[PDB]
Amino acid sequence: FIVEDDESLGHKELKVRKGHIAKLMATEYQDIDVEEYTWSSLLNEGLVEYIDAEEEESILIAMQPEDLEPAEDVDPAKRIRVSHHATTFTHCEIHPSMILGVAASIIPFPDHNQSPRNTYQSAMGKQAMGVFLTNYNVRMDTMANILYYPQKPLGTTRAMEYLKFRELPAGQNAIVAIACYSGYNQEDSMIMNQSSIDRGLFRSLFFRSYMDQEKKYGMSITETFEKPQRTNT
Amino acid sequence: ASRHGQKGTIGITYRREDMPFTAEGIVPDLIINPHAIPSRMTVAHLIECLLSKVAALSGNEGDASPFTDITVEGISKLLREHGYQSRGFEVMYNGHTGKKLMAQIFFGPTYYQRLRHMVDDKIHARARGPMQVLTRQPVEGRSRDGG
């Protein structure tokens, strides 16, 4: 975001206002007759800007607009956050959650995790099972794993709304008890319900495609797709 | 695996009448160990389970974005408004005998992913089999009945 002087309010403010937000939502809900207001409209009006790491060295960025821009009782449950005690900002973050990649945006509450666990989940989210594409029936991929009943997560991030995770999910909402029940879940093991498995919990499709060609080595050395017989083969 | 680096295999499968049950008759689809929680410091697994419980009870999908002003206490208040214990604990009963467990069990929905590592694609044995052409030692790979 672009932070300007904004002499009407007497302090620094983002150039993007509620009218631009309303125009963006009007265009978005038109997509689901007024003027089309897109991302390039924000870019051409100077509301947003493209900053690389070299230009990032000469700017001061506010994390949030409603906290660090306006001049300055607290909830003890909320995390402790500083306001940096400085009003000379040139830019603002659009949202800090966009520092994450595609795989880390699937993680619910990644700021409440240890960072190696976030790295491990970003690794293992690619190994999950879901619906990779909706046209898997007409694709002869070498290996394909499709869950019977994908479910969108109950706890979901805003960012995965753009990752189409609620449209092509990669897991199921399982009712999970954290318990030392029988000693059969020790050292990362888990006890799954067999009755739930019988009703389709985590049941998946597996497809494997075999390719074969009849190649002509020469005149008489050519392959043929046929049913062989024990007498002459 | 959960969405938090909490991977693991199925130790055993129990039927519904052997699983622990709450007073509402709800049995888990999955039992994971408490000892996976404290050393790994995976607090977001617990908050995700709590928020998913509130989400399923209220019908509104939970906002689990990282840097929002969503606290555990707000989710706990919402869970208490639905008539459940605010920290996600439930009085569970032993399925083998019907007696109440002395400790109450953290309970609720959690998103779990089925990873592509099956045991059937990894179980392998070989008493004798084909040998390599060069070294005349057992070949490599379970797809070739290897050693």
Binding site: A26, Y29 | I70, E73, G74
Partner: peptide, 19 residues
């Protein structure tokens, strides 16, 4: 306490009600 729910259908309905 902020509402921990991604409720975007009702906000779309509200914005269409403004229109």
């Amino acid at each position: 306490n902020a509402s921990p729910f991604i409720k975007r259908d009702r906000m779309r309905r509200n914005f269409l009600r403004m229109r």
